[PDB]
Structures are given as structure tokens and as C-alpha cells.
Amino acid sequence: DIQMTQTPSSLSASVGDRVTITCRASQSIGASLNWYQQKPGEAPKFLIYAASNLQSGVPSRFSGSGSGTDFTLTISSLQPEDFATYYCQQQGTFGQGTKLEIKRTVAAPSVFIFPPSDEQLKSGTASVVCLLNNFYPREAKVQWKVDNALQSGNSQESVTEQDSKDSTYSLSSTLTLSKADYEKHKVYACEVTHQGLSSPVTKSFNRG
Amino acid sequence: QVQLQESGPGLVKPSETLSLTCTVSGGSVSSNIYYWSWIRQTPGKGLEWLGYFYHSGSSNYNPSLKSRVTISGDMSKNQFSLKLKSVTAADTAIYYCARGGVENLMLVAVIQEMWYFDLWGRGTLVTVSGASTKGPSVFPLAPSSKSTSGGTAALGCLVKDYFPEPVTVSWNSGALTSGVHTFPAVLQSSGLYSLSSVVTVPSSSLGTQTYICNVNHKPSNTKVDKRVEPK
Amino acid sequence: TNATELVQNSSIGEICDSPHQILDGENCTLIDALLGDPQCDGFQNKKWDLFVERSKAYSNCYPYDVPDYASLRSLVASSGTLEFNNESFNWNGVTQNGTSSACIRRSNNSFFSRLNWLTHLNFKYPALNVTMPNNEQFDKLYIWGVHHPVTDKDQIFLYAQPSGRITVSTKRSQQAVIPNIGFRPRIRNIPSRISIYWTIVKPGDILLINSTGNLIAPRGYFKIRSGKSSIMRSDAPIGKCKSECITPNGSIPNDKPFQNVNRITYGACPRYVKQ
Ligand SMILES: *[C@@H]1O[C@H](CO[C@@H]2O[C@@H](C)[C@@H](O)[C@@H](O)[C@@H]2O)[C@@H](O[C@@H]2O[C@H](CO)[C@@H](O[C@@H]3O[C@H](CO)[C@@H](O)[C@H](O[C@H]4O[C@H](CO)[C@@H](O)[C@H](O)[C@@H]4O)[C@@H]3O)[C@H](O)[C@H]2NC(C)=O)[C@H](O)[C@H]1NC(C)=O
Ligand SMILES: *[C@@H]1O[C@H](CO)[C@@H](O[C@@H]2O[C@H](CO)[C@@H](O[C@@H]3O[C@H](CO)[C@@H](O)[C@H](O)[C@@H]3O)[C@H](O)[C@H]2NC(C)=O)[C@H](O[C@@H]2O[C@@H](C)[C@@H](O)[C@@H](O)[C@@H]2O)[C@H]1NC(C)=O
Ligand SMILES: *[C@@H]1O[C@H](CO)[C@@H](O[C@@H]2O[C@H](CO)[C@@H](O[C@@H]3O[C@H](CO)[C@@H](O)[C@H](O)[C@@H]3O)[C@H](O)[C@H]2NC(C)=O)[C@H](O)[C@H]1NC(C)=O
Ligand SMILES: *[C@@H]1O[C@H](CO)[C@@H](O)[C@H](O)[C@H]1NC(C)=O
């Protein structure tokens, strides 16, 4: 019956910054509001109880405040390990969540490329993998070229979640062709454009 | 400390009854200040409380789930279970068991009912689908000059064409953790998942150290050990 | 020459301090002033015709709950007084005057002024049995409580007894409580809890207290009576003026026969009617 609105949905802040997250209830809820912190791959952690009471294992830089309809969660001095999604909760309803990314110096990716294995090729498919390691920000553009032909519609990528200590990302991009298509062409290359790169970087190999 | 751990199938066909069990270690499941709850999480909903249960027979359920939810307990086993009838693809989620309670505390001049969830399990993925399980193929991502930028070399495993999620990948039986990046799985057009797990190692160690990736896909009862060697 | 209107429609927005004696709770609920929260020490032994409770009020002591909150709140509100009479109970064999860091008074660990946290003495907590006779001609109200430790270790270190039991009796009634050991969320870094209870002792009756541990003991009694005082929740300021009738929205004139400001009134008031 009561619905809560968490603002913002996401934000980025630097180490040492003060960040505040807001949860607002459609009706007054007194002080009956709790906060949780969910780091990647983990379950939520009980952060704050009854609007302002820190729970066990919660660093002092966390605090909460509010009454009635407007509640805030504050991190006084942001740290890299605070990268998480934060949730408000009143009785049986949770807020939508706020994802918090750590802002950081620009870091160019190191790029590696892997040809398809001979075992995979024998079974009829060729997967070429490009690896972009330890970069920031997470915006990156991986382009595949086969004999200097721009590919599209035959690649997929996934990004790791932000590293909780150096605040970098890693990206893997896979290009899949049939064995027949793979051995009809020679040059396989990934072209990587990123803010840390003054020019697009290309990694290639030549057989197939 | 007290710890919770979910157990149950990872793949359930639609219209079946989803069931998961939570086992509680180090704590008295029998104490009527605590309730025992289940919460699920989907990208596109976030966290959704499903229900809780007191061993005294009292229980409370999310009305959005049209009474499809039942939570029951057995103290002979320090366990409580979720049962969710007539599942569809919309019930695909990560499911958490949790301990919590209800307090009637006065503050802001008025007594109000407060709920909380102070202890959570690790969570379990449940995929509701009609497709059948299948184990992955594991192909080497062999280190080469094209994966050696400086004094550092990258190698890994490509874990391809499995269903459903998840797979767990370790390196050298868990003795190798620094530098490992196991990427989230992508779902390809065939309806099967694929992921890669890579690790950056000193290029000097390539001739001396052996590198085994250990892939476990429990839904299909498949374990694969694959050694990655230089090309 | 105004046309007849029998319904009082508006309030002055404030509650007049005359003729009724108004006690503004400010930051303190009546219960917190009753128990003796340190921020509420200025309320000791005060009297009132109308106690006014504020939305901003808050607790700043040991986290507690009151199972029959409304009845205790109404008992004190109608007596119109917080006058406390100390009594010397014989607490032989236990340590008195327990304090906590969640309840600071004058920059020191403290506790509710009207309650007595009893703990073991040399790791012995004897079976206490004390009596208080009530020789007066008015009813006595005794406030006591039960402490719920967070673990068995906590229970042992505090009371040298794994299973505390409390019974408070008179010739007319019997109340038995069992502590519930377990973890609660930290309130002001305290994961334990106290439950507050009350007992009425009629003239000629005796208070009997049995405890083997976990008793938050009374220090005395309050005089109780079903008088004409009351309590009201309101955020309207207390102003200097005279008005016989009081509503949560502020004081009201009592010349019109009817009223549509608020169902809740105090004093000589027009009869409420809806919009
Ligand atoms: C009645 O209660 C109000 C409200 O108290 C406040 O809210 C409660 C819910 C609870 O959280 C209380 O702990 C909390 O104080 C009292 O009014 C507040 O009074 C305090 C101080 O007495 C003020 O706190 C100050 O706020 C400043 C911003 O306006 C801030 O800059 C101050 O920080 C500096 O001072 C503190 C010491 O106070 C020091 O520790 C810091 O390090 C820093 O130097 C300080 O936080 C609140 O702002 C007040 N709030 C309002 C709304 O006025 C009120 O005093 C009380 N009445 C009586 C009679 O007791
Ligand atoms: C007959 O009807 C008139 C007109 O409504 C009443 O007079 C009005 O009474 C209001 C009561 O507060 C006056 O409001 C105040 O006005 C001043 C100046 O504007 C403000 O600064 C102040 O904050 C208040 O808002 C209002 O000024 C007054 N005159 C108007 C509206 O023209 C009259 O009420 C009688 O007079 C008032 C002054 C009080 O003494 C009443 O007790 C009294 O009945 C009405 N008379 C009756 C018998 O109903
Ligand atoms: C636990 O705390 C209570 C109150 O905090 C203690 O009771 C207090 O005991 C002292 C001394 O026994 C009493 O002092 C009195 O002071 C007046 C004026 O200074 C003097 O005229 C009296 O002759 C007497 O010395 C004090 O009144 C009394 N307070 C109450 C409310 O009874 C109690 O002794 C403490 N117990 C322990 C074990 O520390
Ligand atoms: C309380 O103690 C008295 C002491 O004689 C005893 O007679 C009585 O039975 C006790 N009552 C309870 C309920 O333990």
C-alpha cells in the first residue's frame, strides 16, 4: 500500500566524497525505515535500523537520518569498498535501489586477443575473444574486423562489476563464426576505442 | 556466528511447485522473537519480500503472490522451507532466506510496527524454464605473444553452451585467485549461456607453472578440468 | 447583525496556557518522563490538567517497549501528576543501580531515574522476595520491567542465572514474565531490550516481588486516580491567552453550540459535528 521512491537510481562519486541517498515514502512512516548494502555477488547487509541506528560491522562513515516521509543515507567519506547497491526498506517493501559507482582516474585498457582453439574449430564453430583489462571509465567500444570488414550482429560482450579496491573494470568480447566462415578469411582484429586511448588500439592475428 | 544457506533445484519447469530449503547453523531457529523469511531478487524488480513465518504457526505473506507462497519449518532439522506453487518464467529470480523480526517501538510520538532482516543467506538462482539442462564445453584460451603485453600474460578458459546458470570456475583448485576475472555469462541466440574466465600471470611463469581451470555445472552434474598450455 | 452560524469553524492555531494547566512534553513523551529518561528530568513531580505530546518527541535511553502502552499512558495522564514517592525496598544480595552507555545523564553512564537495574553480587543472585504494604488511602502505581539479554553469556554475566523469572503479585493479581534472550537490532548500539510493566496496589493490599534475575526494579510508586486530567497529541504551539476549550489544532471559543475542528477536545467545548 505504501510505496517508496529512492533517488537517485545511480551515481558516481570519488574516494573521499560525501554521498547522500534519499528514500521517500508516499505516506508518513514515522521513523520505521531501514537501509541495506548489497555488494556484488553477495546478499544484502543490514546497515541501519529505525532511520539512524548503525548495525554491527557498519563503518562510522555511514549514517542515516529522517522522519515521516523523507529519509537519507549518508557516507561521510566514500571508500572504494563502498561500491554497492543500497536499498531502503519499510516493513515488507524495499526501495528500487541506488547503485553507487566509485569515480576514479582514467585508466587505459590493456588489450589481449585469443584465436579459437583447434578443438572448438573441429566441432564447427570459431570463438574469437578480446579481453580489455583494468580500465576506467567503463565506457568502451570494441569493434571487430575480419579481412578489414567491420562486423556487426555476431559478437557479444560482458563487463565485470567494478573492482572493490582499484575501481577498474574488465571487458570480454566474443566474436562467433562458423568454421567455414572462419577459414574463408585471414585477418581477425579487435579495434578498441576508450577515453584513455589517444587513438583506437588494434590487436590482431592472421590465420584461418 | 549464525549462518543461513539455501538449498534447492536451480531449474524448475513452469506450473511446478518451486521449493527451497534454508539450513541454519549456530543459532536457535526456535526462539519466537525471530521470524524466518524469503526474499527474491530480479533485475527489473530488485528485492521483493515473499513472506515470513514464525514457528508458533503465525505467518505473513506478500499479497502480490496470490497465496502461492507457503513457508513451513522443521526444528528437528533446524530448517525452514519455501514453497511457491504454479511458477512461470516471471518467477525466475535469485532467492534468499533471511532471519528477522517485528518490534513495536515507540518513536515519533506513535508506536509503529517495525520489520527488519538482519541475517541473509548467500542466495540461489532459480530458473523457471521448459528447456533441458546441458553441460558446457570448455575450450582453452591459450597464452601467446598476442596475449602478452609486457611482463604480463593473459590466459583463460571459454565455458560455452550450457543451460541454465550458473557455472562456477576456479583455477588450480582454488590455489590461484589473484588476477582472475570470471566474466558474467551472456545468453546467446541458441538459448544457451557462454562465459570466459581469464587470469593475468607473469609471463616468466608460463614454462614453469601449470594452469588448470576447474568448471562445475551442478544443474547437469558436470565437472570439467582443463589445462591451459601455451600455443 | 451577523447571520446565524452555530458551528465553530476555525481555531487560533495555538493552545492557550489559561485557564487549564498545560504541560508541554516538548521532546518527551509522558511515558519517557514517567520512567525518567535523562532528557526528561525537568518533568519530575510535575502536575497538569492537560499533557501535550509532540510529534518530535523521542527516546534517548535504553531501548524498551511497553506491551500495554495505551493503558499505562492513560493511567498516568488521568491522574494529572508525576509525583514520585521513593520507597526503600530490601534488595539484599544483589548489586543495585546498574547503568548503561545508551542512557547518558550529565556526561556519565546512567539509567532511568525511577528504575533500579539489579545485577548479581559476587556472582550470586539470590531468589528475591520483597513486600511493600501500601498503608495509604489511594491507589499506588508501580512501574517495573524485564531485561532481555542478547546472549546466554550476557545473561550469565549480568545475573549469574541462566533462567531469570519474575513474579509481581498482590492479594488481587499475579503477573509473571520470562525474559527472551536473543539478538535485536542495535538501538544506539544496544542490541538488548527492556519490557516495561505496571502494577496497581489498592489500599490495604501488599506488593510482592519475586525475581531470580532480569528484574528492572521500581524505586517507589506514583499516586493514581481517575481524575479529570488528560493527554493530547498536538503540534500546535502553547501561547499566552485564555480559552476554556482545547483541540489538537489549538484552542477554541466555547460560545457556539457546535464545532467541526476536531473530534478530540478538552475542557468546556462545543459538541463536535462533521464537515
Ligand atoms: C529537542 O530535540 C531537538 C532535536 O534533537 C535532535 O533530533 C533528535 C531526533 C535526536 O537525533 C537528537 O540527538 C538531535 O540532537 C533539539 O534540537 C537539536 O539540538 C541539537 C544540539 O542540541 C542540534 O544539533 C546541532 O545541529 C547543527 C545544525 O543545525 C550542527 O551544526 C551541530 O553540530 C555541531 O555541534 C554538535 C553538538 O551538538 C557537535 O557534536 C558536532 O561535532 C558539531 O560541532 C549539531 O549537530 C540540532 O540541530 C537541533 N535540532 C533542531 C531541529 O533544532 C533540542 O535542543 C531539544 N530541546 C531540548 C529542550 O532539549
Ligand atoms: C461577525 O462577523 C465579523 C466578520 O467576520 C467578525 O469579525 C471578524 O472577527 C475575526 C476574528 O478573528 C477577525 O479576525 C482578525 O482580523 C485581524 C485584522 O484583520 C487579524 O490581524 C487577526 O489575525 C484576525 O484574523 C476579523 O478582523 C473581524 N472582522 C472582519 C473579518 O471584518 C465578528 O467577530 C467578532 O469580532 C471579533 C473581533 C471577535 O471579537 C469575535 O469574538 C467576535 O464575535 C462576527 N461577530 C460575531 C458575534 O460572530
Ligand atoms: C542507588 O541510588 C540511589 C539514588 O541514586 C541511592 O539512594 C540514595 O542514598 C543516599 C545515601 O544512602 C541518600 O542520601 C541522602 O542525602 C540527604 C541529603 O544529602 C541526607 O539528608 C540523607 O540523610 C541521605 O544521606 C539519598 O537520599 C538516596 N536517594 C534515594 C532516592 O533514595 C542508593 O543508596 C544507591 N545504592 C547504591 C548501592 O549505591
Ligand atoms: C514468592 O516468594 C514467596 C516467599 O515466601 C513464596 O511464598 C511464593 O510462593 C513465591 N511466589 C512465586 C510466584 O514464586
Q: How many CA atoms lie within 13 A of C238 on its CB side?
A: 17
Q: Which of B49, B139, B154 lies at the smallest CB-CB distance from A131?
A: B154
Three-state DSSP at C241 gives strand
Distance from CA of A105 to the nearest CA of B (A): 21
Angular region, C80: left φ>0, alpha ψ -120 to 50, beta rest:
left
Superfamily designation of domain C1-20+237-275 = Hemagglutinin Chain A, Domain 2 (2.10.77.10)
CB C215 within 8 A of CB C146: yes
Cell numbers at C170, concatenated: 498482590
Q: Which of B31, B104, B111 lies at the smallest CB-CB distance from C182?
A: B31
Residues B22 and B55 reside in one and the same domain: yes
Are A56 and C186 in contact (CB < 8 Å)?
yes
- Dist. CA C267 → ligand 2 center (Å): 23
Where does a domain end: B71, B102, B130? B130
> How would you class B222 by CB atoms within 10 Å of its CB: exposed for 0-12, middle for 13-18, buried for 19 or more?
middle
- B176-198: string of b/e by CB count within 10 Å (b at 16+)? beeebbbbebbeeeeebbbbbbb
For ligand 4, atom 5, name the residue with the nearest CA. Answer: C129
Indicate if the alpha-carbon torsion angle C104, C109, C112, C113 is positive or negative. Answer: negative
CB A108 within 8 A of CB A197: yes
Where does a domain end: B88, B112, B130? B130
- Dist. CA C210 → ligand 4 center (Å): 6
C154 to A122, C191, C203, C234: CA distances (angstroms):
67, 11, 39, 41
Are C59 and B107 in contact (CB < 8 Å)?
yes
Distance from CA of B39 to the nearest CA of C (A): 19
Resolution to 1 decimal place, in Å: 2.2
Ligand 4: does its nearest atom lie under 6 Å from the Cβ of C173?
Answer: no
Q: Which residues contact C261 (CB under 8 A, 6 or more apart)?
A: C8, C9, C10, C11, C247, C249, C252, C272
Q: How many other C-beta atoms can be found within 10 angstroms of the C-beta atom of residue A119?
A: 12
CB B50 within 8 A of CB B38: yes
DSSP A150: B
Are C186 and A49 in contact (CB < 8 Å)?
yes
The class of domain C21-236 in CATH terms is: alpha beta
**H or E segment at C262?**
none
CB B203 within 8 A of CB B151: yes
Rg of the Cα trace of chain C?
22
- Dist. CA C232 → ligand 2 center (Å): 28
- CA closest to A67 among chain C residues: C56
First to last CA, chain C: 25
Distance CA C194, CA C65 (A): 6
**CATH dotted code for A104-208:** 2.60.40.10
> What is the 3-class SS of chain B, one letter each residue?
CCEEEEECCCEECCCCCEEEEEEEECCCCCCCCCEEEEEEEECCCEEEEEEEECCCCCEEECCCCCCCEEEEEECCCCEEEEEECCCCHHHCEEEEEEEEEEEEEECCCCEEEEEEEEEECCCEEEEECCCCCECCEEEEECCCHHHECCCEEEEEEEEEEEECCCCEEEEHHHCCCCCEEECCCEECCCCCEEEEEEEEEEHHHHCCCCEEEEEEEHHHCEEEEEEECCC
Residues B90 and B142 reside in one and the same domain: no
What does the domain layout of chain A look like in residue ranges? 1-103, 104-208
Residues B81 and B193 reside in one and the same domain: no
Where does a domain end: B80, B108, B130? B130
- Dist. CA B80 → ligand 4 center (Å): 41
* Whether the bond into B166 is cis, omega within 30 of 0: yes
Distance CA C24, CA C17 (A): 10
Vertex C26 angle, CA C48 and A26, to 5°? 125
CB A173 within 8 A of CB A129: yes
C129 to A42, C68, C209, C216, C238: CA distances (angstroms):
52, 25, 6, 14, 47
Vertex C129 angle, CA C127 and C135, to 5°? 170
Ligand 4: does its nearest atom lie under 6 Å from the Cβ of C210?
Answer: yes
For ligand 4, atom 11, name the residue with the nearest CA. Answer: C210
Distance CA B220, CA B208 (A): 34
A121 to A48, B190, B194, C96, C173: CA distances (angstroms):
54, 18, 16, 82, 87
Maximal C-alpha separation, chain B: 73
What does the domain layout of chain C look like in residue ranges? 1-20+237-275, 21-236
Residues B85 and B154 reside in one and the same domain: no
Q: How many CA atoms lie within 13 A of C227 on its CB side?
A: 18
Cell numbers at B68, concatenated: 502461492
Q: Which residues contact A184 (CB under 8 A, 6 or more apart)?
A: none
Are C53 and B109 in contact (CB < 8 Å)?
yes
Are C185 and A54 in contact (CB < 8 Å)?
no
Mutate to test the pocket of ligand 3, among C45, C88, C95, C97 (most ligand atoms within 8 A of CB): C97
Q: Which residues contact A154 (CB under 8 A, 6 or more apart)?
A: A144, A175, A176, A177
Are B188 and A176 in contact (CB < 8 Å)?
yes
Distance CA C56, CA C23 (A): 15
Q: From the CA of C88, give the closest atom in ligand 3.
A: 32
Distance from CA of A33 to the nearest CA of C (A): 13
CB A199 within 8 A of CB A181: no
> Look-up: residue for cell 564445453?
B137
Distance from CA of B50 to the nearest CA of C (A): 21
- Report the pocket of ligand 1 as residue ranges, CB < 6 Å: C 26-27, 39, 58
Q: Which residues contact A149 (CB under 8 A, 6 or more apart)?
A: none
Residues B82 and B141 reside in one and the same domain: no
Q: Which residue segment(s) compose the domain that B37 sits in?
A: 1-130
* Whether the bond into C218 is cis, omega within 30 of 0: no
- A195-207: string of b/e by CB count within 10 Å (b at 16+)? eeeeeebebebee
- B33-64: string of b/e by CB count within 10 Å (b at 16+)? ebbbbbbbbeeeebbbbbbbbbbeeebbbbee
Contacts of C99-104 with CB under 8 Å at 24 or more apart are: C100/C62, C100/C190, C101/C189, C102/C61, C102/C62, C102/C63, C102/C187, C102/C188, C102/C189, C102/C190, C103/C37, C103/C38, C103/C60, C103/C61, C103/C62, C104/C38, C104/C60
Beta partners for B187? B193
Distance CA C13, CA C237 (A): 8
Interface test with C, best of A32, A47, A56, A58 (most C CBs within 10 A): A56
* A56 contacts on C by Cβ (under 8 Å): 186, 191
Cell numbers at A11, concatenated: 551515481
Interface test with C, best of A33, A48, A49 (most C CBs within 10 A): A49
φ and ψ at A111, to 5 degrees? Answer: -115, 130
Are A44 and B117 in contact (CB < 8 Å)?
yes
Number of the ligand closest to the Cα of C96: 3
Residues B108 and B144 reside in one and the same domain: no
CB A93 within 8 A of CB A37: no
Distance CA A172, CA B194 (A): 11
Residue A134 marked ligand-binding: yes
Q: From the CA of C27, give the closest atom in ligand 1.
A: 1
The class of domain A1-103 in CATH terms is: mainly beta
Q: From the CA of A52, give the closest atom in ligand 1.
A: 11
Distance CA C199, CA C195 (A): 14
Distance CA B28, CA B36 (A): 12
Q: State which approach was used to obtain the coordinates.
A: X-ray
Distance CA C62, CA C37 (A): 9
> Look-up: residue for cell 514464525?
B54
Cell numbers at C261, concatenated: 475542528
- Dist. CA C129 → ligand 4 center (Å): 7
CB A191 within 8 A of CB A203: no
Are B147 and A112 in contact (CB < 8 Å)?
yes
Beta partners for C24? C52
> Look-up: residue for cell 488511602?
C137
Q: What are the DSSP calls for A30-87, one per residue?
A: TT--EEEEE-TTS--EEEEETTTEE-TT--TTEEEEEETTEEEEEESS--GGG-EEEE
Cell numbers at C69, concatenated: 502502552
Interface test with C, best of B33, B34, B54, B99 (most C CBs within 10 A): B33
For ligand 1, atom 16, name the residue with the nearest CA. Answer: C27
Ligand 3: does its nearest atom lie under 6 Å from the Cβ of C97?
Answer: yes
Cell numbers at C241, concatenated: 491567552
Vertex B135 angle, CA B133 and B141, to 5°? 145
CATH number for B171: 2.60.40.10
Rg of the Cα trace of chain A?
23
Distance CA C194, CA C208 (A): 21
Q: What are the DSSP calls for C172-190, one per residue?
A: S-EEEE----S----BTTB
Distance from CA of C86 to the nearest CA of B (A): 27
Distance CA C100, CA C122 (A): 20
Residues B54 and B136 reside in one and the same domain: no
Q: From the CA of C127, give the closest atom in ligand 4.
A: 2
Distance CA B211, CA B170 (A): 11
CB C206 within 8 A of CB C170: yes
Distance CA A107, CA A63 (A): 32
Residues B112 and B137 reside in one and the same domain: no
CB B154 within 8 A of CB B143: yes
Angular region, B116: left φ>0, alpha ψ -120 to 50, beta rest:
beta
Amino acid at B163: F
